[model samples]
Structures are given as C-alpha cells and as structure tokens.
Target: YPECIPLSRQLRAGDEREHDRSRFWIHPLTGSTGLYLKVAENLGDDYAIWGIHSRGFLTRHPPLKSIESMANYYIEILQAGNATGPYELAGYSMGGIIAYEMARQLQLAGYRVSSLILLEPPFPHPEHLHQSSPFYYHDALLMSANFFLHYSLKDIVAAFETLAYREQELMGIDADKQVTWLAEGCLRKGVEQPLSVVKEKIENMAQILKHNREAMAAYVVKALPNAHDIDLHYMTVSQNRHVLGEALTHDESHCQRWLDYLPGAQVFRTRAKDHFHLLSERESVAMISDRCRTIYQNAS
Candidate 1:
C-alpha cells in the first residue's frame, strides 16, 4: 500500500535545482491536486509548490483516519525529502483544517512555520459528525455522479432519495458490498464510463471522503502554543453561506470567529461567489495569488 504522496508540481521558473522557498498546498476533500495549478502558476518561479494529496489515490490502502495522523504522514514525507523550514503551508476547503494541523504539529516539533494560508475552511462543529458508514456512501455516490455524468443537482438528489429509502437493507451489509450496491444505483442512473471504471471511481472517492469526513468531524481546534506568532491568512467568500451554514458562524462574522482561534490572523474577503470558486474562479485565484506573493516577499 502506498502512503500519501507529495505530488510536487515544481513551479520554479529558474534553475530546477534551486528555489528560494517551498510552499505545501494540501488537497481538498475530493483529494484532487488539480485545484492549485492556477494559483501555483500565478505565484511565479521563486517557490516550489508541493501538493499534499490524500492516501489511497495511487493504490489500495486504508487511508489515515484522523487529522493528527494525516498531518504526521505529510510532515514525515517533508522531512524525508529534506525540505526545511520555516515552512509555508496552504489549503483549500477541507484542506484548510489539515494545513492548520500541519502548522500546529510543525511548531510542536520545534520547527518554524513561516505562514499558513487557509481558503474558506469550515469551522468544525460537533453537530457535523456522521453517525455511520452509509453517509459516506451517499456523499461518494453524489460526488462521482455529478463529476462524471454531469448530473444536475435535482437529478442527483432524486437518485439519492430513491436509494436512501433502502438504507435499512444497505446498513446490514459490509462496506464493500454497500459500495457495490450503490455503484449499481449510480450506473443505472447513467454514466459514460464503463461499469468497472465507474465502480472504482466511486470506491476510491468513498474511502477518501469517509476518512476526511470522519477526521474533520472528530477534529477539535486547540490553541496552538505559537498561535499569535504565526503569519496566518484566511480567505472567505461573500456567497454560498448555506454550504458552510452555522459552521461559518451563527452570531459573529466568519472572520471574527476565526480570529478567536488564531489571534491577529489576516482575513481577506474574495469576490468569488462560493467556497469552490475561491480557488477556481480567475478573479478569486488572482486575488489569492497576489496576496500569497506579497506574503512570500515579505517573509524574504
């Protein structure tokens, strides 16, 4: 079984052997490293950008299930690669939580983390926890169908509801059997890919999503020993408040809530309409890249 891979998309424009800095970007819940390509390009040649993809993407293995273990896996990989600190770290969505843990662990290990950039992270709430495995199956099915079949939101919801009525029977079977059952449902709905490919995609997505979801749900944000000293930048969007919902904040502004965790964190509001667009939309990416470049330059 392969461990978490440090998929390095070396963004350096100068000599390949030398770079002034290294920035590690963690992958979101989907475990796709593709999201950071545009931002890495915008940041230019001075830094080597490494994407921290989740485990089980390359080969079959049980993914690390906790936030601490996931952070430790990445840190071990960095040390083995001889990447030194003060390290620069960033994450989008769910990746934001992992990156935050990385910084906390690095500091605990007596390493200096120069900066942490979080893009629209969900504030972990106890109510968000999943009660069982079927929840992951539901999420994985919806995600795969939407991505591969281009199913509309309404179509996906309808399909999920149809399958959900059979949840009692699904819960009786093992996870692999549950995946096969759900995969059949997805295939019946229509997919361009062959059955085997679709099944594999659903399986992989389900495993990664399950581990990440559990980790996030179980994670409790503790005060970092060097919290006030770290250069922390948080980016928030103006729309799609529903996705984050109460997780963003109930009574206080999102930025204000985050400040309670990391005092003096620099929060920036983006023009992007929602959480996903914070990295995908051109204007949002540009603003993020510009801010990141400024941070790097200042650190120099």
Candidate 2:
C-alpha cells in the first residue's frame, strides 16, 4: 500500500523516449501530498515528479514512529519501483527533514543522491529531541479546528475560552469531558459538520499529526559526512523569525545552523511571506522550480 504516487501526468512513449529526464521524489509533510502540486506543475517536463505520502493515511497499517523507519519504508518503495540513482529528492516543511534522512540512507547504501532540496525545513531543536508529550484533548481540538475548520489559532483560542466560560461545565471536568462538551457545542452551533463526519476527519488528522510530531521529536539531526559532495539546496523564508521558536532567528543564524550540519549546503532566501507559502506562492514556486532545473541540468 505504501508506494510513490505520481503527481504529474505521464507523457506518451515517444515523448518519454525522446527526453532523458530524471525522477524527482518529493516527501510529504503531515501526510499531505497536495501541497507540492504547484511546484510539480511549475517543474515542467524535465522531471517525473513522484509524491511519497506518509503511511496509514489511507490504510489500516500503523504509521511509522520514527524518522529512520519512515525513510527506510520510502526508500524500499523507490527501489521496488526501479528508481535508479543518482536520485533527486526534495521536500517541504517536515517532508524536508524526511528527505534529508532519505538522502543519508541512500548514500550509506551506496546509491547516489544527486540533489537534496529542502524547502523551509524546520531546524531540529532540543525541544523535539526527546519523545513528545501526550496528545491531550485540547491539543487535538486545536489542531482539528485550525487545519480543518480554517480557524486561525487566535480565534480558536478565543472561541474555546468563551465556550469554557459560558458552559461552566469545563471547570470541574477532566480533559476528556471538556473535549466532549466542546465537540457537542460546536455541533450545536453548526460550526462543525455532522458528528460522524467531523469525528472521523478529526480522528484521522489527529492520529497523523500525533505520529508525525512524535517522529519529528525523536529525530536527531546529524552531520552527513558526504553531504558536501551532494548537491544540497536549502530554501527558506525571509519573514518568519524561526520555524519552531526563537532558538535560531530567520536571518543569518538560521542559515548558519543548517551549515553546522550541512557544510556545503547552498541556502536561498525566498520572497514567500511565510513557511506555508514557500510552495504555494507563484513567484516562490517559480524560483524553486528554476533552481531545481538548473541543478538537474548541471548534474552529469
């Protein structure tokens, strides 16, 4: 069930035979494959774009719990698909971290990774170095509201507090009871869809988010000895102060931190306003695609 899904349309055999293009595999962030659609479209016909989504998104299998496990699983899928190296890997956000691990593993296994393009990947901080804490009801509710309901974080917090004050039931209730009351309130107010549909969607997204968060928390970013030899590109946003927190500012410090792990990495600051828009904005996607094509064309 875990396989590399094609994001781009396959050309005719004549066109395929005429153009000798490389396969580009992009890892997804939080099990989302649609995020890279704009980039894929902008990349044109020089590369075959494949999306690697997290497992357990559509299947009954349990999601991978660690970065290494996820990397191994995806690499196996690539090999099974007869994807010969030198490989071209790119990812956005959390996906970028997974791509880095994938490149490291490929190099260790004697496969050539021609390019490692990371688009605004968050620097691994000490806060995520240990196992993540429990996923509480409030955390799940907040994530669901923000991701699915399109409610801003600030608005979600305000709404939650307002409801808590009005209900008076949340004061003495446990976390589980509080969540139940909130869910019922949302349904009653028509803020959420049908109970069954909303519950299922929230559960699925919450599970994926929890597993990916835990995986990121346990991941330890290490120095790749052969990273200097690879074509490493790290694209970042200029507006955000930092991805996770204030550990490393978005200016020179962020680039320097990445250099600590990847000495030969070429950092590019994009015009995108924030982390999420790096792959979505038209100009930023154009820049990313152009850079990727330039690297691929230069690669022998």
Candidate 3:
C-alpha cells in the first residue's frame, strides 16, 4: 500500500515534511483497549498508519500474531530514525505493542523519542499472549455487545441466542436507527484520527489477510532487544469492573507487569470508563496526550 521503503526500513516521507510536530496513533481492534476518542484527536492528524495494515506481510493473524505485526511496524519506524532527537508516537491496545517496539528501536538507535502514548496496552507478559485465544475474546465481545443491544439481563433468550448464533463478524457492519448514534460515534472517531492515515495500510492488511500465507508459518512472539528502553505510558479501561464481558480482562496484570518492567513509563487510570467509553471521554483520553505534551515541552 505505501510501497514504503523496502519493507526493511521506514518509508521516507515523500510529502512535504511538517516539522512543528508529528504523531502516531495506534488502534487496537481487540482486547481491553477497545478504542479511545480524545487520544486520537490529540495526535493532531492522521500521519501514516503502520503495521501489517501497511506491510503486505502477514506476521500473524489475531488467530496467529495480530500483535506481532503491530510490534514490527513500530520497530521499523523507530529503526528508520537514527539516534536523533525526540519523535512522537502512540498506539491503542494491540497496536501499543508495536509502538513499544518502535520506542525500543529508537532508544537503541540513540534517538531521543519525545513522547510515547499507550491506550490500554495489554498485559505485557508472555503468558498473557499465549492465553489470549480467539474463543475467549469472542465470548467477551459478545457479552459486551449484549449490553449495547439494550437487551438487559432479562432478555436471556435473545442475548444468548444472538451470542450463540451471531456477532463477531457483524458488529462493525451495522448502524440501525436505534444504534445509528453509535455508528456516528465510531465514524466521528475514524475521521478524527487514523482513518485518513491508515486507509491504504488497512487495504493492504485486508489483502494479506486474504492471502494468509506467512501466518500459516510461525507468528512473531519474541520481544525486541530494546523494548524496555523508552519511557512508556498507559491508559486502561477501568470501568469494566464487574461487567459481563469485563471478566475476560481478569489477567491484565501482565500490563501492570509491563509497568513494573518499564518503570520509566507513565500510566494513567481511567477509573470511570470502560472500553471505548474511555475514548469517548475527553478527560480520559487527555490523560494520555497530556502526558505526551508535557514530554514534548520538556524535551531538549
């Protein structure tokens, strides 16, 4: 899609470079980090969407290494930058893994990465990824979908029947009259940030998904050498406490462990919001970019 460099390096920006600032937004389609809105707006504009979305390669599918494609994309981006000064970067959920890897690359390259933003990064443990199978996620998403459907606890038959029979592939496809508002919500988000930046990358990912060749091999699971080098930051969906689908998030300490591992990174908790709701709240998302901005101002 990008015809980016050689796939071994970050694409040199062909467009006129705008130096005042640059931003990267990571969008995770799965996991506790559903999507956050304010963070997207703060990234300023759709820069370039990275990941398998851009590379024609299939490092792994969610069924394989969905997060790995995410990891390498950022690695390439950071490596492309020789130890210069600070650079801006951000990612959501699975994409955060990629951003983290990117940060590591820059840190190793001797560059001073200006800011790093993570939106509900996953538990940073190997066990977390291994245990993260599709069955568990499908169940969790369906449970959340039930709540959104306004089915309430009483609509047992309808809710479970729908979960038992439908969902997953259907969620992003519709915006009925009653739910039209939510679609508006999602579209506002897409346009506000990565949509324009990621269009081509997304199309390429789709083609890769269609091909499904490399993923049939081994998925990218090992961590990058310098992953712990940069200052990382996190925003998690804390509002899901006791919610149905929220159960799937039980073992998120791996993310906490991530904080422990990269003690240099900053973490902000969105205590009142769950999942995408955090994205919708201005305050919640600001916690992320606000930190980024602080870093930018303080940078040399």
Candidate 4:
C-alpha cells in the first residue's frame, strides 16, 4: 500500500552506493560522490557531512583535486535521487572542508549555499617544512577552531572539566609511563563539566579522530588521499608554512589567504581557544550553535 515516486537514474561507476533516506541523494564527480540532503525548508544553508562518512577522496590539488571529487561525488549521490536546488554546508575538520565543495558543487550545479560552517579548515598550497611554525605545527587543529565561538572564557573552561585521564589511567600503569601518556592528552582544570561531558561536548573533535584511517587506507582501494580533498598543492592540509603562505596560519590571517578564492563566502576571525579546546570550549560551541540557529531563524 505504498505510493511510488518516479526517480531519474544514472549508471553507477566506481564504488557508488545508494543512500538509505529518500531526503538525501548522492551524486558522482571525478574523485568523489556527492550526497545531497533534502531539508524541510531551504534555509540557504548547505548540505551536511557526517564526520568520516563523507570522506569522498583526499586530494593533492584544489578545484582539480578537491573540487572534482565533490563535483563527481555529489553527481552520484544526487543521481540516486533528484533535487531542484542547493543546500547549506556544515562539517567538522576535513568534513568541514568537504562541505566547501559540497557548497561549490551545489552552486555550480545551480544551487545556492548561503553560509558555510567550518570547524577548522587546514590549507596552504605550497605548504612545506620550513613554512611550519610551533604555533601551526605543534598546536592541535581543534585548538585553532576555538576562536569562532561567541561564548565566554568561563564557558570554555567549564567544557574542559574532565579531559585528563590521571586516576582512571593511572590505576593500572606505573607513574612513569602513565604520566607520559596521560600528559599527551592532559588538559588543565578550569572547565566545569566532567570527562563524559568534555568528551561528548567535543564530539566534533572526536568525530574527526577516526578519519585518519580513511586517508591512510586510501591506497588500498581508492586513490591516495583522493586528491580532491587536497587543493592543487600537495595535501588538503600540510605542515609547511610556505604552502600556507605564513608561518602561523592559525589564530592569524596566513590561513585566510584562501578566503580570496571564495567570493560570496565570508570568513570570520577571533581569538580564545586553540584546536584542542575549540570543540570542547563552551564559547566556541555557543558561537557555532548560535550561528546555526540564526541561519534557521533568518530563513524561516
């Protein structure tokens, strides 16, 4: 007793698969397959990428590499369904970068991506060893994203309450090794929440953690790093300062160089949290959350 809706179909190539929901459709471009989501109302937002699920292909080049992948991927995903318009884009880390082309492709595909929510996009075409600095190299990507939030410093501190693994981590091992490993992920006390909340609060950072595997395992089946993810340089994100055009892109404009490339897109700047604390920081999350809400409110 189900009504069938007619759908336009395309021949499948590569490893393209059908999506489960009727709302979101995936399309194929050179290196990637784009999945378009059908929103209740077009809030002038872009399609969303759920962490590692939308890895597409890692690119060594930009439009050629990353752009192509997005173009192709969305082609495949949309072909699975049919959409008349564009969707907003939002993603974390590399997923956030993927959202870039997802918006661009949708734009070129004749759709409008009014806003883009980037949770840390690491790019610098000529990125190289000498180009890197302690600020850019040593700091975590999550830490750099802390600037976007509109929350207070106290909120940020409260979000990082239980980042340390001291007692739980120490009970089994000796003080020496425990101290070392613990230090690697150690965070100071200031945030109000506990480990569970901190871990959950920083889901954006945590969601991105498993993505390392996709890029690492790329050579086995798909191409290495999917070049589409990279921006016509060596990689999507590099440690080289030259590629980034400055020694310190994070908490600075060196990274904003790419902004010139995106005309309609708006880039924001603020200082408070670094990569590690970006997600877990209360202020940062509040900023992002508020932005999302405003997008919806304006659209409605």
Candidate 5:
C-alpha cells in the first residue's frame, strides 16, 4: 500500500511542486474540464496535489457514459497510480459524485477511505431523470467569470451583448441574430471561423454534457454493508438555501438528501455562497481547505 508507483502510472495535474511524494488526489468537475481545484493549494506542501482526468481527451475510447463504468474505470486508475487505502479523496460538483462512487468502489475492494469530501454535489433524485441537462456548462463558465470580473447581473447581460456586437462586425451576421445566439454558445466563437466548425464543437460538447446529465440521473446510491459504510463530509452553499427542493434534495433542510445517501454524513454551511462560484472564491476555498487540512496531518 505504501509502495511508489511506476512513472507510467502516476496521476498528476502538473509538474511536481514542493511535495511530490504525498498521496492525495482531486478529480475535475463535469465535462472533464482540466480545471484543477486551486483551493487545494492551501492544503500545504506536505501533500501532493494529484487528480484524475478524462482519457477521452486523448484516446479513441470516449468518456464512459455511465457513472458505474466511470467509477470502476477510475478505481483501476487509482490502483495503477499506487493510490491505496486509507485513501483521501475530494471532488467538486460532478467530480464530487464521481469521487463518492470511487470511494464506494474502493471500500468494496477492501480498501479504507480516510476522507470523502463533496463540494456542492447535486444529489441523484428521481426528478433528475426528468431533466435532460443537469446544468448548462456555458452558464457555469459565465458565472465563474462573473465572480472574477465582479460583474452585476445587469453588467453580465451587457457583456453578453457587447460580445455579440463584436461578432456582428466580424461574422457579417445581423446584430440582432448574433445577439440571440450569443446568449448561448461560446461568446468569442461566432466571428472567428466557419459556422460549421463552431457547430461541430457545440455538438460534441452538448453530447458530453448530455452523457453527464443522464449519468447522474441514472445513478442509484447503493448502501455499503455495515462493515463498509463510512462517514462523509459535505459542504453546502448558503445563498440559495431556500430554493433547494425538499423531497428531492432537502437542500436547506440540513442536507437530508446527502444523509439519505451516506448515513452519518455531516454538512458544513457556507456564507452566501452558491454552487458555481464557491470553488473559485478564496473565502469559500479557505473554508474547504480548513476541512481538508486535517486529512494530510494523518496521511503518513
């Protein structure tokens, strides 16, 4: 369990930083964005900031379309990397769901998971099956940019318009038509290339998003045997607490949805935070770091 993995098997986000020998890993959010969790930087140098990424980006095998396959596949990746129990794992958004399933698989394999942290992961509900898209990643990108730009809702709307105005001049399309479509796809895409190329990328991304959305909807949380069940930690957003569903998510109702899945799971509330912006903001990141810092202390 403590052996070093062969170079071919190590999972990494970037070239080794100060502490490359540590054993911790993070996974990318939905769509396998290649987005590393910056909050982990605050977790200190004693631990290596490792993570899992999509092989689909490089290979002929597309991203697995089912959560079960995703988990089983990732378990193999972890082992190849010499990651063994008791493992420390944390993931944000879709990554969180994947992390949970991975941990469950680890436990099934007779490994011990020391910590499982989910950052604003949506619960799989019967209603999730009704919605085709769990979320629009385009909107998530806008929300993240807005956080960094400190833009108001009105200003964000203005920025969208501004981009379209630029497109009209560049793509030779009517300003109005550009504005209509601008609310949707890549903001900078229209004017630069062939509409056919833009369409192809959108179709591919949409296909990937659909797979993720359906994958979550199709997931059914299975109970681990009494011996395998473990305590879990969930971090929740405080701003939209009132808008969370009752029977489905129990969003603000003390995280009952999470409890429904992981018995004895604990929830930590954030200050006026929402799912999209939480990981990008330092204030929120600091909170996550605090909860995770403890895991490294005992990881040796």
Candidate 6:
C-alpha cells in the first residue's frame, strides 16, 4: 500500500460514453491547488478535468525530491486513471515547470499531447543560480515583503513579527517581548487571532512553500537528442511584465524563452494583472478558459 495519498483528483468528469473526448489534467504549485479549481469549472462537460495536488501537504509524505521524479509519479497516476493520449495539460507557476518536464517525458515515449498550457512561467537562469543577481534577490524579497506589507491584520502581524526577529538580532533587544507586543498590537487593532496562533500558522505554511521552491530551483532536466518541437500554449499578463519591477527593463518576455525552446508556440497576452492575480481576476480567467476551449475545438 502506498503511504502517500495520490495527488491527482478528478475535478470534473467528462462524458464517459463519448469517444474522442480529451482528458485535461492540471498540476498544482508548491503542493497546493492553484488555478486548477477555477479553470476546471469553466472547461465545460466535454473534457475531463483533474487537479494534481502535490505531496506532503495533508499526509506524512515528504516533499518532492526532484522534478523528474515528480513528473514520473504524476504520469503513473494519470495512466492509472485511464487517461490516454492526445491529452491536454495545464499548470500554474511551479506547476507549469513540472508540466513542461512531463510533456518532455511523455513526448519521448511517443505519446500525443493536445496542449500544455503554461501560465506566466519564468524562465530559469542557470548562471544566476550560483552567482548573486540583485534583481533576482530583491524580486524574491519583494514577493515575501508584498505578502506582509498589505495593511490587513494577518499581514501586519506577520510583518511586525519578522521585523522583531531581525531587529532584535541586530540591536540588543528582547526578541520574545517584542514578538508578544507585536502580536498584542495586532489584536488591539482588531485582528481575529489572539497573538501566538497567528504567528504559528503563517510560519509553518511559509516554510512549506520555501521547501517546495528550493526543490524546484535545484531541478535540471536534459533534453533528449531527438526531441522535437513541443506545442506550448503560453499565456502572460500584460501589466505584470517585469519580475524585478523597474530594475530589469526591456528584458525578453518569459514566453519567448519557451518559444525559443519549443519554436512556434502559440502565445496569448492577457490583461493588466500579475502572475498571482491573473488567476483570480474574472476577465483573465475567462480569457484563459476561452483559449483552452478554442484549443479543444481545433483539435476535435
């Protein structure tokens, strides 16, 4: 018996008796459900939609050690579910990265893939992985900062707690009291949590996200010698342009990298939203779901 529960679960069942119906499987990011739930809702009843949840979230399973292994695991799950080729696949963020590798593996085995939808996936800069780049450094920092900078109760509490730990380490102050005071301050400002509970929940989830990201960052896949062009469905947000804001300008679009890798991939430019908000906004979701429907119609 496999100890870890299967990550993939069918979100919407397609018409079983209908032949030629495509199966669409979505991969999640950082072991959490991403745009899978929302997009699956709009894919209609003609196609089967399954959300691939990652391991180690709810069970005693450990984090995915490598991307190759992760892709192989998902391939087995999809096969076990009776999903056959000419399959449609989509993934968000890191899930997009995993999906790309899976597409490569599946193509190697001579399986037909209908589409691989990549939602605002950033290209890997192997050189920067070792050396320090100011832009990438602050990009990661700002994303973490953005999570706590917002003026909500949850944000304020975590932000202050972060400051207290760093400030107390630098300046000789009582870290424990400062954290307690920060927690109390949040409560005084009408927060839901008492003090300690808020800090605990935020840190635990943050660590899990960090672990998953590190695992992805460490992954590298070698393309097969006879690998052919992969038909990639690239989507990006227009306003959410730069990963490093103004610091890195006039950089080639992220989708272009996939085009370079797979040549002649179909690209769709979405509206004014960042990578994260692109999935949440109504207009963007409609556009994404619309493109997916268009792809299926073209194929069938």
Q: Could you tell me every candidate's TM-score relative to the true structure?
A: 0.77, 0.74, 0.51, 0.41, 0.66, 0.68
lDDT of each: 0.68, 0.63, 0.44, 0.34, 0.53, 0.56
List candidate 2 segments past 4 Å from native: 1-22, 25-29, 127-137, 150-194, 239-252
Please provide, for model 5 over 2-21, each residue's C-alpha lDDT reduced to its tens digit, 9 standing for 90 to 100.
Answer: 22221121233355443343
Candidate with top TM-score is 1
Candidate 3 residue lDDT tens string, 1-300: 233332221123335353333345544433212243344346444232222232333332233344455455545544454234456666665456556666655565556565666766544333433354333333333333333333223444423343332443455553233123232333353223234333333333334332222221223334444545455666676632122122224235646655654656766666545555556677766765565556555545
Model 5 per-residue lDDT at 130: 51
Most accurate candidate by lDDT = 1
Return the candidate ranking by TM-score, descending.
1, 2, 6, 5, 3, 4
State the lDDT at 243 in candidate 6.
31
Instruction: Look at candidate 6 and give me any clashing residue pairs.
Output: none
- Superposed model 1: Cα runs more than 4 Å off: 1-6, 10-15, 127-136, 149-193, 239-254
Better of 3 and 6 by lDDT: 6
> What's model 5's overall lDDT?
0.53
Q: Clash number for every model? A: 0, 0, 14, 65, 0, 0
Clashing pairs in 2: none
Q: Is candidate 5 or candidate 6 better by TM-score?
A: 6
Model 6: lDDT to the true structure: 0.56
Q: lDDT per residue, candidate 6, 109-168, as tens digits?
A: 867666777776655555554354333322232233233323243353224443322222
